[PDB]
Amino acid sequence: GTWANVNQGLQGTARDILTTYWQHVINHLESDNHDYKIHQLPLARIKKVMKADPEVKMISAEAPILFAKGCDVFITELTMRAWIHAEDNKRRTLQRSDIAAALSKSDMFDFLIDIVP
Amino acid sequence: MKEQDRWLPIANVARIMKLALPENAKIAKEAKECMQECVSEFISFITSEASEKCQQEKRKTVNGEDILFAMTSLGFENYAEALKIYLSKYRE
Amino acid sequence: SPLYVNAKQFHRILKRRVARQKLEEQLRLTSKGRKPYLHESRHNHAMRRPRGPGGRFLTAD
DNA sequence: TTCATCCTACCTCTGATTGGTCAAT
DNA sequence: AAATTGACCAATCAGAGGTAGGATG
């Protein structure tokens, strides 16, 4: 189903936590009075990442705006998924190995195979 | 192109990470750098797919619809569905 | 390393491998590590700035 | 023709970058 | 004992945002 990625590879309580976060995101994304200027990530840097690829010619203002939101969500859910492993190892510090472990739980993250060996 | 421009700024990435964790949590430098690389690849991965479809259709501009289509194509169906109403409201 | 990965992602993963290799060469990146800092001027500022006894930049009133 | 919105270049104004010490591990 | 390393502080400057003028669809 269209939401399978939300819980994919997660166990027990973690499923509820990620599901509830997504619900929160979806509710926000439905809000009627968005400020399309204010984001945690700078639009110009998103555009620059996009423009690093010479195949990309022109870019609608729509695209960095969607990425601004999408990337926020991506960082948040991956961080929440990774924290599970830090807690499992009774650690207070999130390590790279926690991110690698999180990535291994869902094939949605297969695109990062070379980024995080 | 400047080499740092292939990535989103690390401080912004780390700040989003900090908000996703308990207040007592710490984040290794390597974890911030890793996350930075992951989220930047996410943009480039989806963009490349959108770009190639744009080129095939002889359109020069990548738009919001192109991003959403690439997202579902690449197995990010949840991201595409969640951002659908966001795009439509932006457009009105 | 597996032969089969996410079927929706595989072809784009291969295309991105080529693009990343080309970009690394474009940017003249050879070592497998980042610089200690990005900007000489920002390094200099951080080196020059007054600190407290605990190494922190002085608090602003 | 008029409308929408891209590009680049230029201008404001600024917020991400940054390291010595302490403390946790 | 010794080594490792992440939070802490905020001012300067690389750069984000805004947009005029031109172009495109």
Tab-separated table of C-alpha atoms (C1' of nucleotides) in Angstrom:
chain	number	residue	atom	x	y	z
A	1	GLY	CA	0.000	0.000	0.000
A	2	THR	CA	0.963	3.663	-0.406
A	3	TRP	CA	1.964	3.944	3.294
A	4	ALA	CA	3.918	0.668	3.631
A	5	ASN	CA	7.237	2.594	3.814
A	6	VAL	CA	6.186	4.272	7.102
A	7	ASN	CA	6.362	1.044	9.184
A	8	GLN	CA	8.520	-1.054	6.827
A	9	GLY	CA	10.976	-3.136	8.884
A	10	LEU	CA	9.926	-1.643	12.241
A	11	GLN	CA	8.894	-3.646	15.308
A	12	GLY	CA	6.373	-3.071	18.123
A	13	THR	CA	6.131	0.435	19.586
A	14	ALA	CA	8.412	1.897	16.867
A	15	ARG	CA	5.646	1.301	14.289
A	16	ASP	CA	3.220	3.490	16.273
A	17	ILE	CA	5.818	6.224	16.789
A	18	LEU	CA	6.709	6.560	13.089
A	19	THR	CA	3.040	6.247	12.064
A	20	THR	CA	2.060	9.048	14.465
A	21	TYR	CA	4.878	11.261	13.162
A	22	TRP	CA	3.656	10.730	9.573
A	23	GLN	CA	0.097	11.516	10.647
A	24	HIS	CA	1.442	14.754	12.172
A	25	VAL	CA	3.275	15.584	8.946
A	26	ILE	CA	0.225	14.832	6.776
A	27	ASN	CA	-2.010	17.015	8.967
A	28	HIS	CA	0.509	19.871	8.646
A	29	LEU	CA	0.811	19.402	4.912
A	30	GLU	CA	-2.984	19.893	4.754
A	31	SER	CA	-2.865	23.171	6.727
A	32	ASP	CA	-4.472	26.109	4.868
A	33	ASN	CA	-2.059	28.949	5.688
A	34	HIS	CA	1.454	27.864	4.706
A	35	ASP	CA	4.381	30.211	4.688
A	36	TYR	CA	6.337	28.952	1.666
A	37	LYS	CA	9.409	31.032	2.593
A	38	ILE	CA	10.193	29.626	6.080
A	39	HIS	CA	12.022	26.239	6.077
A	40	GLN	CA	14.695	24.475	8.131
A	41	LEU	CA	16.712	23.963	4.905
A	42	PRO	CA	17.638	26.843	2.545
A	43	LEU	CA	15.821	26.698	-0.799
A	44	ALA	CA	18.882	28.009	-2.674
A	45	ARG	CA	21.004	25.088	-1.435
A	46	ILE	CA	18.375	22.542	-2.425
A	47	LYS	CA	18.327	24.153	-5.891
A	48	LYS	CA	22.132	24.025	-6.048
A	49	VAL	CA	22.118	20.275	-5.224
A	50	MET	CA	19.619	19.820	-8.052
A	51	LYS	CA	21.708	21.974	-10.411
A	52	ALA	CA	24.890	19.960	-9.737
A	53	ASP	CA	23.478	17.514	-12.311
A	54	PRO	CA	24.172	18.880	-15.847
A	55	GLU	CA	21.085	17.040	-17.187
A	56	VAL	CA	18.925	19.455	-15.170
A	57	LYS	CA	18.159	22.606	-17.160
A	58	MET	CA	15.524	24.851	-15.571
A	59	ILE	CA	13.820	24.355	-12.206
A	60	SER	CA	10.368	25.532	-11.138
A	61	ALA	CA	10.197	27.152	-7.700
A	62	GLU	CA	7.814	24.232	-6.943
A	63	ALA	CA	10.641	21.684	-6.821
A	64	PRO	CA	12.895	23.100	-4.087
A	65	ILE	CA	9.765	23.855	-2.030
A	66	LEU	CA	8.636	20.217	-2.203
A	67	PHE	CA	12.192	19.068	-1.393
A	68	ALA	CA	12.371	21.468	1.557
A	69	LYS	CA	9.401	19.670	3.120
A	70	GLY	CA	10.336	16.181	1.880
A	71	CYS	CA	13.923	16.462	3.123
A	72	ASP	CA	12.799	17.647	6.555
A	73	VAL	CA	10.637	14.521	6.776
A	74	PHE	CA	13.435	12.320	5.408
A	75	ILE	CA	15.997	13.525	7.976
A	76	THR	CA	13.443	13.247	10.799
A	77	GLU	CA	12.217	9.713	10.085
A	78	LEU	CA	15.725	8.361	9.358
A	79	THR	CA	16.990	9.954	12.592
A	80	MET	CA	14.062	8.430	14.568
A	81	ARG	CA	14.696	5.024	12.953
A	82	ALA	CA	18.438	5.283	13.754
A	83	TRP	CA	17.831	6.255	17.399
A	84	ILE	CA	16.200	2.871	17.965
A	85	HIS	CA	19.643	1.262	17.567
A	86	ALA	CA	21.349	3.722	19.892
A	87	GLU	CA	18.730	2.877	22.544
A	88	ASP	CA	19.116	-0.853	21.860
A	89	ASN	CA	22.859	-0.467	22.558
A	90	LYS	CA	22.168	1.617	25.703
A	91	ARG	CA	23.923	4.646	24.189
A	92	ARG	CA	23.044	8.358	24.386
A	93	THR	CA	25.106	9.294	21.316
A	94	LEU	CA	23.778	8.583	17.815
A	95	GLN	CA	26.548	6.987	15.727
A	96	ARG	CA	26.950	6.509	11.985
A	97	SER	CA	26.535	2.741	12.582
A	98	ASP	CA	23.040	3.488	13.931
A	99	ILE	CA	22.142	5.123	10.601
A	100	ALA	CA	23.622	2.151	8.674
A	101	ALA	CA	21.559	-0.225	10.847
A	102	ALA	CA	18.372	1.794	10.262
A	103	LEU	CA	18.955	1.758	6.490
A	104	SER	CA	19.225	-2.038	6.500
A	105	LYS	CA	15.588	-2.412	7.691
A	106	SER	CA	13.830	-1.158	4.537
A	107	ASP	CA	14.611	-1.489	0.833
A	108	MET	CA	13.319	2.082	0.438
A	109	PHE	CA	16.857	3.027	1.481
A	110	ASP	CA	18.607	0.859	-1.147
A	111	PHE	CA	19.523	4.048	-3.085
A	112	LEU	CA	22.017	4.794	-0.261
A	113	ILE	CA	23.991	1.522	-0.614
A	114	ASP	CA	27.104	3.389	-1.847
A	115	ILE	CA	26.619	6.439	0.404
A	116	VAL	CA	26.569	4.313	3.572
A	117	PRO	CA	28.525	1.033	3.026
B	1	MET	CA	30.574	24.564	-8.967
B	2	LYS	CA	31.870	24.708	-5.385
B	3	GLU	CA	32.414	21.316	-3.738
B	4	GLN	CA	30.251	22.092	-0.662
B	5	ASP	CA	27.299	22.764	-2.979
B	6	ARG	CA	26.705	19.055	-3.581
B	7	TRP	CA	25.398	18.952	0.009
B	8	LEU	CA	22.874	20.764	2.143
B	9	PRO	CA	24.566	22.782	4.944
B	10	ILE	CA	25.502	20.502	7.858
B	11	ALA	CA	24.241	22.845	10.625
B	12	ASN	CA	20.703	22.821	9.174
B	13	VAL	CA	20.766	19.028	8.796
B	14	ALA	CA	22.080	18.521	12.352
B	15	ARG	CA	19.397	20.872	13.751
B	16	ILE	CA	16.606	18.785	12.201
B	17	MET	CA	18.330	15.692	13.649
B	18	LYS	CA	18.477	17.256	17.140
B	19	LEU	CA	14.699	17.954	17.030
B	20	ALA	CA	14.051	14.276	16.179
B	21	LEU	CA	15.911	13.044	19.294
B	22	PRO	CA	15.499	13.325	23.114
B	23	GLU	CA	16.952	16.499	24.683
B	24	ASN	CA	19.714	14.516	26.424
B	25	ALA	CA	20.833	12.819	23.182
B	26	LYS	CA	24.165	13.542	21.497
B	27	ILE	CA	25.024	13.131	17.806
B	28	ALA	CA	28.454	12.034	16.563
B	29	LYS	CA	30.104	14.274	13.963
B	30	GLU	CA	30.261	11.235	11.634
B	31	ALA	CA	26.489	10.770	12.043
B	32	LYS	CA	25.797	14.408	11.084
B	33	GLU	CA	28.091	14.067	8.064
B	34	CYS	CA	26.458	10.758	7.093
B	35	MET	CA	22.945	12.228	7.361
B	36	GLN	CA	24.050	15.244	5.315
B	37	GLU	CA	25.241	12.904	2.547
B	38	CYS	CA	22.057	10.772	2.706
B	39	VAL	CA	19.585	13.646	2.414
B	40	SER	CA	21.639	15.231	-0.362
B	41	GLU	CA	21.619	11.946	-2.329
B	42	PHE	CA	17.838	11.782	-1.781
B	43	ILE	CA	17.501	15.133	-3.655
B	44	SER	CA	19.947	14.119	-6.427
B	45	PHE	CA	18.476	10.594	-6.813
B	46	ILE	CA	14.884	11.865	-7.212
B	47	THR	CA	15.985	14.869	-9.335
B	48	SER	CA	17.918	12.647	-11.796
B	49	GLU	CA	14.817	10.480	-12.362
B	50	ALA	CA	12.661	13.615	-12.869
B	51	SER	CA	15.296	15.222	-15.128
B	52	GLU	CA	15.477	12.208	-17.458
B	53	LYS	CA	11.681	12.095	-17.864
B	54	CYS	CA	11.666	15.838	-18.586
B	55	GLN	CA	14.354	15.375	-21.253
B	56	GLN	CA	12.406	12.526	-22.912
B	57	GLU	CA	9.311	14.754	-23.065
B	58	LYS	CA	11.446	17.634	-24.445
B	59	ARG	CA	10.549	19.932	-21.529
B	60	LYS	CA	13.262	22.169	-20.080
B	61	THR	CA	11.744	22.858	-16.639
B	62	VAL	CA	11.536	20.330	-13.793
B	63	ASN	CA	8.302	21.088	-11.911
B	64	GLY	CA	6.566	19.880	-8.726
B	65	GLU	CA	4.581	17.226	-10.617
B	66	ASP	CA	7.849	15.832	-12.016
B	67	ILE	CA	9.246	15.490	-8.475
B	68	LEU	CA	6.113	13.713	-7.232
B	69	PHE	CA	6.102	11.329	-10.219
B	70	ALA	CA	9.785	10.493	-9.697
B	71	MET	CA	9.078	9.875	-5.991
B	72	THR	CA	6.422	7.227	-6.692
B	73	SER	CA	8.485	5.713	-9.545
B	74	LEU	CA	11.470	5.267	-7.222
B	75	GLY	CA	9.491	3.654	-4.375
B	76	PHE	CA	8.879	6.743	-2.219
B	77	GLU	CA	5.084	6.417	-2.639
B	78	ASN	CA	4.422	7.824	0.838
B	79	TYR	CA	6.486	10.965	0.164
B	80	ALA	CA	4.669	11.558	-3.136
B	81	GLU	CA	1.182	11.112	-1.598
B	82	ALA	CA	1.951	13.305	1.428
B	83	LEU	CA	3.376	16.111	-0.775
B	84	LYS	CA	0.488	15.957	-3.299
B	85	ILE	CA	-1.914	18.232	-1.377
B	86	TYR	CA	1.035	20.470	-0.383
B	87	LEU	CA	1.798	21.029	-4.091
B	88	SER	CA	-1.871	21.629	-5.001
B	89	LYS	CA	-2.289	24.253	-2.251
B	90	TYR	CA	0.931	25.962	-3.319
B	91	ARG	CA	-0.493	26.099	-6.857
B	92	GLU	CA	-3.787	27.746	-5.805
C	1	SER	CA	27.011	-6.622	-1.958
C	2	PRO	CA	23.770	-8.091	-3.402
C	3	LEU	CA	22.995	-8.739	-7.072
C	4	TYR	CA	19.391	-7.559	-6.759
C	5	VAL	CA	18.335	-4.402	-4.922
C	6	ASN	CA	15.013	-2.518	-4.809
C	7	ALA	CA	13.702	-3.084	-8.353
C	8	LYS	CA	12.218	0.439	-8.488
C	9	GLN	CA	15.611	1.958	-7.663
C	10	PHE	CA	18.239	-0.227	-9.383
C	11	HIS	CA	18.562	1.529	-12.773
C	12	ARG	CA	18.647	4.963	-11.168
C	13	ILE	CA	21.256	3.744	-8.629
C	14	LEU	CA	23.533	2.722	-11.531
C	15	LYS	CA	22.983	6.058	-13.311
C	16	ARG	CA	23.774	7.906	-10.058
C	17	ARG	CA	26.993	5.902	-9.578
C	18	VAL	CA	28.235	7.295	-12.931
C	19	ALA	CA	27.082	10.845	-12.125
C	20	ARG	CA	28.745	10.800	-8.692
C	21	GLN	CA	32.045	9.529	-10.147
C	22	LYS	CA	31.967	12.262	-12.798
C	23	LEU	CA	31.137	14.972	-10.261
C	24	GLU	CA	33.995	13.892	-7.964
C	25	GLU	CA	36.353	14.296	-10.930
C	26	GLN	CA	34.775	17.634	-11.896
C	27	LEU	CA	35.323	18.915	-8.336
C	28	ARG	CA	38.928	17.580	-8.285
C	29	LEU	CA	38.192	15.372	-5.268
C	30	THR	CA	40.829	12.679	-4.779
C	31	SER	CA	41.131	11.851	-1.059
C	32	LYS	CA	38.328	9.958	0.708
C	33	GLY	CA	37.945	12.633	3.410
C	34	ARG	CA	36.652	16.144	4.096
C	35	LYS	CA	38.748	19.237	4.881
C	36	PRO	CA	39.140	20.305	8.541
C	37	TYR	CA	37.189	23.473	7.604
C	38	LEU	CA	35.637	25.045	4.490
C	39	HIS	CA	36.773	28.665	4.678
C	40	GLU	CA	40.080	30.254	5.559
C	41	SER	CA	38.369	33.488	6.662
C	42	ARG	CA	35.929	31.631	8.965
C	43	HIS	CA	38.764	29.572	10.449
C	44	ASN	CA	40.681	32.793	11.098
C	45	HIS	CA	37.653	34.415	12.764
C	46	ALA	CA	37.190	31.388	15.024
C	47	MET	CA	40.932	31.400	15.882
C	48	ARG	CA	41.008	35.175	16.605
C	49	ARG	CA	37.745	35.453	18.634
C	50	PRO	CA	37.945	35.996	22.390
C	51	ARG	CA	37.046	32.942	24.472
C	52	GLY	CA	36.254	32.291	28.136
C	53	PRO	CA	38.483	30.060	30.319
C	54	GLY	CA	36.432	27.027	29.198
C	55	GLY	CA	37.213	27.627	25.509
C	56	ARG	CA	33.712	28.848	24.598
C	57	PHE	CA	33.221	32.031	22.616
C	58	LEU	CA	32.403	34.781	25.128
C	59	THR	CA	28.724	35.097	25.997
C	60	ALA	CA	26.883	38.077	24.499
C	61	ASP	CA	25.105	40.386	26.954
D	1	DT	C1'	-1.438	40.214	-27.088
D	2	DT	C1'	-1.241	39.298	-22.081
D	3	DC	C1'	0.177	36.371	-18.349
D	4	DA	C1'	3.356	33.423	-15.627
D	5	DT	C1'	7.746	32.580	-14.340
D	6	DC	C1'	12.052	31.053	-15.685
D	7	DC	C1'	17.229	32.838	-16.182
D	8	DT	C1'	21.256	35.857	-14.581
D	9	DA	C1'	23.258	39.776	-12.142
D	10	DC	C1'	23.153	42.751	-8.609
D	11	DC	C1'	22.016	44.306	-4.063
D	12	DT	C1'	20.721	43.660	1.113
D	13	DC	C1'	21.316	41.520	5.114
D	14	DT	C1'	22.406	37.703	7.352
D	15	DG	C1'	22.748	32.805	9.793
D	16	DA	C1'	26.146	28.749	9.130
D	17	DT	C1'	30.676	28.063	10.118
D	18	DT	C1'	33.932	27.443	13.589
D	19	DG	C1'	37.740	25.625	17.772
D	20	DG	C1'	39.699	25.398	23.029
D	21	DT	C1'	38.240	23.397	26.963
D	22	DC	C1'	35.562	20.396	29.894
D	23	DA	C1'	33.426	16.319	30.885
D	24	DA	C1'	31.669	11.765	29.656
D	25	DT	C1'	33.032	7.429	28.181
E	1	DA	C1'	46.229	6.271	32.747
E	2	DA	C1'	45.573	7.862	28.564
E	3	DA	C1'	42.767	8.588	24.528
E	4	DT	C1'	38.628	9.940	22.200
E	5	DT	C1'	35.154	13.158	21.116
E	6	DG	C1'	30.632	16.036	21.357
E	7	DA	C1'	28.410	20.224	23.486
E	8	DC	C1'	29.103	24.741	24.326
E	9	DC	C1'	29.459	29.781	22.959
E	10	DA	C1'	27.849	33.827	18.796
E	11	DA	C1'	30.364	37.225	15.183
E	12	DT	C1'	31.972	37.482	10.952
E	13	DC	C1'	31.585	36.661	5.757
E	14	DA	C1'	30.067	33.123	2.076
E	15	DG	C1'	25.845	33.038	0.616
E	16	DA	C1'	20.466	33.091	0.969
E	17	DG	C1'	16.703	35.753	-0.417
E	18	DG	C1'	14.732	39.290	-3.345
E	19	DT	C1'	14.049	41.059	-7.713
E	20	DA	C1'	14.918	44.062	-12.284
E	21	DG	C1'	15.414	43.259	-16.812
E	22	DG	C1'	15.310	40.050	-20.459
E	23	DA	C1'	13.590	35.761	-22.470
E	24	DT	C1'	10.561	31.931	-23.149
E	25	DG	C1'	6.292	29.386	-23.510
